[PDB]
Amino acid sequence: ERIRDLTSVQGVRENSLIGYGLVVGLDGTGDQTTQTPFTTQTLNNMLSQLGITVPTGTNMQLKNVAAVMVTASYPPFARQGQTIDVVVSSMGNAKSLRGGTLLMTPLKGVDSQVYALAQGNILVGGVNQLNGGRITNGAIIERELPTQFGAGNTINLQLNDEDFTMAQQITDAINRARGYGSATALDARTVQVRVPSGNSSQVRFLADIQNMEVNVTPQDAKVVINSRTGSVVMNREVTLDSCAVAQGNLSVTGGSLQSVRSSANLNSVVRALNALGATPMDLMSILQSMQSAGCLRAKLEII
Amino acid sequence: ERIRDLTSVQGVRENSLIGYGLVVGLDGTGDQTTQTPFTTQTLNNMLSQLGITVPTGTNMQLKNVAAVMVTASYPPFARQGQTIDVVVSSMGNAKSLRGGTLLMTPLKGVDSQVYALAQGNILVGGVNQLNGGRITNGAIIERELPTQFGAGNTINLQLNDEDFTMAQQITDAINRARGYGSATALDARTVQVRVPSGNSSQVRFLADIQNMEVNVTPQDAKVVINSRTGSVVMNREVTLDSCAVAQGNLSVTGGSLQSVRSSANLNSVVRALNALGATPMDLMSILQSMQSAGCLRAKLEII
Amino acid sequence: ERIRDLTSVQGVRENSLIGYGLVVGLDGTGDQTTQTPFTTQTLNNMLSQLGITVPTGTNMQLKNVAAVMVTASYPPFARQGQTIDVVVSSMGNAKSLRGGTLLMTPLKGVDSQVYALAQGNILVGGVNQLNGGRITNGAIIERELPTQFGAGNTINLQLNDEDFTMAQQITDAINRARGYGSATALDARTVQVRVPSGNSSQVRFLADIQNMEVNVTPQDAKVVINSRTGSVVMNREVTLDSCAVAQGNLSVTGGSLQSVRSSANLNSVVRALNALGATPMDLMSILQSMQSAGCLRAKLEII
Amino acid sequence: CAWIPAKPLVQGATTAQPIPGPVPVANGSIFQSAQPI
């Protein structure tokens, strides 16, 4: 299952669909509709379409209706009649969407064409979000996308993470179980494979390819720091050099300057960094300072 | 039962029907009708149709009537006279729909044509939703849709989830119990089967096909995180690499940087992640940071 | 009794009838009639018809009269003189319909023609609904519908739920006890049977057909979630795959990530899901997340 | 003197017909961008 988990097929991709709708059946937790004119305007549009023309000059003050935006993913090779999941998010001053029902909503693409029609019952968790829900199989595909799959004798596998070693390894793995010249790497992120002419032939070839297992090679040393959530993650290839670290309210347990032992593997790094007795908030600053000095032999990314 | 649970037949699909109606018989828990003019307007329309013309200039302040939207699904091969379930959702400032009765409601399609007529008694749970109910067999089909089923010698089975391996597996399964060239995969999501010319012949063929069992192949490794409900779900094909994790108020039980053991199967992953002693809210951030670093060898989806 | 409980006969269907009436004899629990002008207007109409012309300019403030809507079902092959049950629902600001009597009410069809005449005593339960009641044999059929039953040699049995396997099974069952070519399936929802020419002959044939028993075949795996009532129902064909589940305030009983054992039958699924110790409100989110991930091998419907 | 032919100030055409757009490529994407400037 390595090749499918590492790469993606060229032309097999997911698009994004968006639309506007109304959610009805709320228990008095909808829009105020005095500060969100589009809710009442679109309700009047729906009624006018259905055969009820409410007078232009009138005051409608609803409480069970909310104006929402619906987002979905158009899956690869989607055919009309299939169903997809949608996400429903409130748009103006609505308290909750607990037990609402999404009315008929056309999901447009980037090209402003309807690719799906959405309508269903929203499932809201019930510290849980109240203005956001999900409808499983809530939208039906109405339009299909032409594709070039099955045409030509080349298929590109696109690596999720760029690596010359991994690209070469996938090339050598495809060229071991599937013939001599069945794959050629084009760059650090693309492996071009030669496929038989046809549609089912390429499907069979890619089915074979996808479940093959490749031995993942060492992949860069990096320390990911998320300051907004206060988390630090170090992969296996992170090392350290011997150097001294000082920080506020931290001391040898006896001065404030603690020596960090050079470290070869990740267990040594973890032990050396835990010897400092540093909170992760302090550990982030320690890692940044060590990266500046040169003790930390890894790529420090702040996400 | 695998093929029916995995695929859908081309042209065998469900449509969405919508309509507007009134719910009567509520115990003073209907619309205020002073802030929802359409309720009184449509009640006057109904009376005028029935033979009662209420004066244009008058004040009607009802309490047992609510204006509702009715939604239903038009089932495949629906014939006139059959019954379907409908969902009734209040539209404006109604307290409840406990024991109301849905009056005659025409359910329109996307093409604004009446496909069903809805009327019945609403069943409301009774923390339960009060403005939303369901009527079983509450609508009768009045229009039928022409279809191309039974015409031609090709039928497309559309996989619910795109997979070249699964498409090839279904193709090989249909071509084992039903002849040599009875199925051909067209893409990652479509399997074209050759069916005899006729209507009952295709029904028999698809009845045979649908209950066949296919051996489901490994299907991608993915971690689904629902932040709105605070849930994390990992399938069997999720693995881990050895790396260090630090987060606020979490420590080895002795520093704050805990080593996560490489993990091959899902039990190892669960044990390694439970060794951190992390709340799911913290676990979501841990998983996101590990995906950024590269320890988590899976596809992280946020739903 | 399987065929009658699974299918319906073509042309044997129920229509919906609606009408407006007045309910009298209430113990001061009728309309205010100052906010519902149609009650007094229709009472004056009734008096004018009966021979009493109340002056146009006058104030009538009734308390024992309520304006109601009456709904009924027109049964198949209904003949004039037969009686049907009706449902009486209040229409404006009436407190109760406890011991009221429904005056002569013409029940119109969709074509605005009188098909029944309704008049009787309302039975109200007495947390019970007060503005809604039912009258058994409260309406008498006055019009009959022409039908094509007994004409032609084809009769369509329409399956309640679409299934190619079930359609084929009914076709084979009818063709086992009633001759070689007595039934042909037309689609996933229709079985066409060949009947003798005549009226009583078709009645006899359908009497034979209806009580036949068919062996119901596995029917799709689906999990029904009703968030408005907070209920989850899983049928027998629901399975699970091994995967890890995390949710708020749920832990192994010891981390927060609990492994759910792969499950083949429904008992295994129930045991695995009860091992999580999840409230149904949490179980709904768990099931949705597992459907997103891929552990849940069933069709998740939100009703 | 008002009948003398004269050349207006804004010469040329005072309208432009929208040009039909390129045919989308068969790459499996909904977003299709014309020749970018």
List Cβ<8 Å contacts ≥24 apart for B144-148. B144/B78, B144/B79, B144/B80, B145/B15, B145/B74, B145/B78, B147/B11, B147/B77, B147/C187, B148/B11
For residue B182, the one-letter residue type is S
Spatial contact of B233 and C243, defined as CB atoms under 8 Å apart: yes
Looking at chain D, the number of H-run helices and the number of E-run strands are 0, 0
The C-alpha atoms of residue B188 and residue A78 are separated, in whole angstroms, by 10
CB D30 to CB A148 under 8 A? no
Measured between alpha carbons, how far is A138 from A17 in angstroms, rounded to an integer? Answer: 13
What is the distance between the alpha carbons of residues B119 and B123, in angstroms, rounded to a whole number?
13
d(CA B199, CA A187): 52
- CA dihedral over C75, C81, C85, C89, signed as positive or negative: positive
Q: Is the dihedral of CA A195, A196, A199, A201 positive or negative?
A: negative
Q: How far apart are CA A117 and CA A136, in angstroms?
A: 13
Cβ atoms of C157 and C207 closer than 8 Å? no
The residue among C280, C161, C263, C279 whose CA lies nearest residue C225 is: C280
Closest partner CB to B63 (pick from C92, C186, C226): C92
The closest of B69, B53, B61 to B19, measured between CA atoms, is B69
Does B37 sit within 8 Å of A58, measured CB to CB? Answer: yes
Sequence-separated (6 or more) residues with CB below 8 Å from residue A59: B35, B37
Chain B residues with beta carbon closer than 8 angstroms to that of A199: 184-187
Q: Are C246 and B231 in contact (CB under 8 A)?
A: yes
Within an 8 Å CB–CB cutoff, is residue D22 touching chain A? Answer: no
Kindly give the residue spans of alpha helices, DSSP state H, lying in chain A: 2-6, 37-50, 164-177, 200-210, 266-275, 280-293
* CA–CA distance, B6 with B160 (Å, rounded to integer): 6
Q: Which residues contact B34 (CB under 8 A, 6 or more apart)?
A: B61
Q: Could you tell me which of B277, B226, B270, B271 has the C-alpha nearest to residue B247?
A: B277
A74 with D26: Cβ contact below 8 A: no
The verdict on a CB contact (< 8 Å) between A136 and C302 is: yes
Polymer length in residues for chain C: 303
CA distance B103 to B112: 20
Neighboring chain A residues of D26 at a CB cutoff of 8 Å = 146-148
The method of structure determination was: cryo-EM
CB of A96 closer than 8 Å to CB of A26: yes
Q: Which two tokens stand for residue D32?
A: 């299709």
Tokens of C297: 């091998």
Helix intervals (H) in A153-251? 164-177, 200-210
Q: What are the structure tokens assigned to D6, written together?
A: 């004269």
A131 vs C280: CA distance, rounded Å: 21
Size of interface A-C (CB pairs under 8 A): 34
DSSP state of D17: P
Whether the CB-CB separation of A60 and B276 falls below 8 Å is answered with: no
Tell me B123's DSSP state. B
Cα gap A162→C45, rounded to integer Å: 84
* Continuous segment of H or E residues that includes residue B246: strand B243-247
Label the pairing between strands A222-226 and A299-302.
parallel
Residue B205 belongs to what H/E stretch? Answer: helix B200-210
* Residues of C in Cβ contact (< 8 Å) with B2: none
Identity at B224, one-letter amino acid code:
V
The alpha carbon of residue B7 is apart from the nearest alpha carbon of chain C, in Å, by: 11
| Measured distance CA(C73)–CA(B122) in Å, rounded | 16
User: Coil, strand or helix: which one is B261?
Assistant: coil
Token digits of residue A194: 């030669």
Return d(Cα C9, Cα B87) in angstroms, integer: 26
Surface-to-core class of residue B80, CB atoms within 10 Å of its CB (0-12 exposed, 13-18 middle, 19+ buried) = middle
User: What string of H, E and C letters represents the secondary structure of chain C?
Assistant: CHHHHHEEECCCCCEEEEEEEEEECCCCCCCCCCCCHHHHHHHHHHHHHHCCCCCCCCCCCCCCEEEEEEEEEECCCCCCCCEEEEEEEECCCCCCCCCCEEEEEEEECCCCCEEEEEEEECECCCCCCCCEEEEEEEEEECCCCCCCCCCCCEEEEEECCCCHHHHHHHHHHHHHHCCCCCEEECCCCEEEEECCCCCHHHHHHHHHHHCCCCCCCCCCCEEEEECCCCEEEECCCCEECCEEEEECCCCCCCCCEEEECCECCHHHHHHHHHCCCCCHHHHHHHHHHHHHHCCEECEEEEC
Q: Tokens in use for B140?
A: 């009768």
Which residues in chain A have their CB less than 8 angstroms from residue B255's CB?
270, 273-278
Phi, psi of B14 (to 5 degrees): -110, 135
Structure token pair of residue C197: 């020419």
> How far does C175 lie from chain A, in Å, by closest CA?
33
Pairs across A and B, CB distance < 8 A: 286
Tokens 């071991």 map to which residue?
A176
What letter does residue A130 receive in the DSSP assignment?
S
Cross-chain residue pair D27–A11, CB shorter than 8 Å: yes
Q: Least CB-CB distance to C302: which of A125, A127, A135?
A: A135
User: Which one, of C76, C62, C98, lies nearest residue C15 by Cα?
Assistant: C76
- Tell which of D25, D30, D32, D33 to mutate to test the A interface (max A CBs under 10 Å): D30
d(CA B141, CA B81): 5
**Torsion B30-B31-B34-B40 (CA) sign:** negative
- As a whole number of angstroms, the distance between CA B20 and CA B17 comes to 11
SS3 category, A282: helix
Collect all residues with Cβ–Cβ distance below 8 Å to C142 and sequence separation of at least 6.
C80, C114, C115, C116, C117
Scanning every residue of chain D, which has its alpha carbon at the shortest distance from the alpha carbon of A115?
D30
From the list D26, D28, D30, the residue facing A109 with the nearest CB is D30
Tell me which chain C residues have a C-beta less than 8 angstroms from the C-beta of B61.
Answer: 35-36, 92-93
How far is residue C132's CA from residue B25's CA, in Å, rounded to a whole number?
5
Q: Which of B79, B131, B285, B55 is nearest to C10 (CA)?
A: B79
CA of A107 vs chain D CAs: smallest distance (Å): 13
In the numeric block, the tokens 């509702």 are attached to B68
Q: B112, A49 in Cβ contact below 8 A?
A: yes
Bridge-partner residues for C244, per DSSP? B234, C259
C266 φ, ψ (degrees, to nearest 5): -75, -35
Breaks in chain B after residues, C-to-N cutoff 2.5 Å: 126, 253
Number of residues that this document lists for chain B: 303
Whole-number Cα distances in Å, C45 to A16, A117, B51, C55: 60, 48, 11, 12
| Token reading at B27 | 């115990």
Cβ–Cβ contacts within 10 Å for residue C241, how many? Answer: 20
Q: Determine D/C contact with 3+ CB pairs under 8 A as the test.
A: no
Which residue type occupies B205? F
**């795109």: which residue's tokens?**
B162
Contact A120 C228 (CB under 8 A): no
The DSSP symbol for A12 reads -
d(CA C153, CA B143): 23
- Give the C-alpha distances (Å, rounded to integers) separating B70 from B50, B88, C27, C203: 22, 5, 35, 37
Question: Min CA distance, C145 vs chain B (Å)?
Answer: 14
Contact C120, C61 (CB under 8 A): no
> Rounded distance, CA C13 to CA B83, Å?
9
- Which of C228, C248, C288 is opposite residue A136, by nearest beta carbon? C288
User: Residue A38 CB: number of other CB atoms within 10 A?
Assistant: 15
Is the Cβ–Cβ distance between B165 and B187 less than 8 Å? no
In this complex, do A12 and D28 lie within 8 Å of one another by their Cβ atoms?
Answer: yes
Identify the residue whose tokens are 């890692």: A287
CA B6 to CA B186: how far, in whole Å? 16
Within 8 A by CB and 6+ apart from C224, the residues are C231, C232, C233, C234, C301, C303
Three-point CA angle C163, C271, B281, nearest 5°? 100
- The 3-state DSSP class for residue B54 equals coil
Determine the Cα–Cα distance for residues C78 and B163; give it in Å rounded to an integer: 54
**Contacts of residue B17, Cβ cutoff 8 Å, sequence gap at least 6:** B71, B72, B73, B74, B107, B108, B109, B115, B116, B139
Collect all residues with Cβ–Cβ distance below 8 Å to A219 and sequence separation of at least 6.
Answer: A161, A163, A166, A235, A237, B294
- C-alpha count within 13 angstroms, C-beta hemisphere, residue B190: 20
Distance CA C251, CA C214 (A): 46
Instruction: Give the span between the Cα atoms of B87 and B3, in whole angstroms.
Output: 30
- Which residues 6+ apart lie within 8 Å of C172 measured at CB? none
- Phi, psi angle pair for B164, to nearest 5°: -65, -40
SS3 state of residue B247: strand
Q: How far apart are CA A50 and CA A60, in angstroms?
A: 18
C15, two tokens: 């229509």
Q: How far, in Å, CA of B202 to CA of B204, rounded? A: 5
* Burial (0-12, 13-18, 19+ Cβ within 10 Å), A73: middle
**From CA C227, how far away is CA A121, in angstroms rounded?**
9
Calculate the CA dihedral of residues B45, B49, B52, B54 and round it to 10 degrees: 20
Read off φ and ψ for residue B86, nearest 5 degrees: -130, 155
> Whole-angstrom Cα distance, residue B150 to residue B205?
11
Question: Are residues A97 and A26 in contact, defined by beta-carbon separation less than 8 angstroms?
Answer: yes
CB of B42 closer than 8 Å to CB of B20? yes
Q: Rg of chain D's alpha carbons, rounded to an integer?
A: 21
Contact by Cβ (8 Å): C160, C145: no
**Which of helix, strand or coil describes residue B133?**
strand
> Resolution reached, in Å?
3.0
- The rounded distance, in Å, linking the Cα atoms of B230 and B250 is 19
Q: What token pair was written down for C166? A: 């079930």
Class of residue B69 by CB neighbours under 10 A (exposed 0-12, middle 13-18, buried 19+): buried
Q: Chain centroid to CA A226: how far?
A: 17
Chains C and A touch (3+ CB pairs under 8 A): yes
Cα–Cα dist C162/B11, whole Å? 13
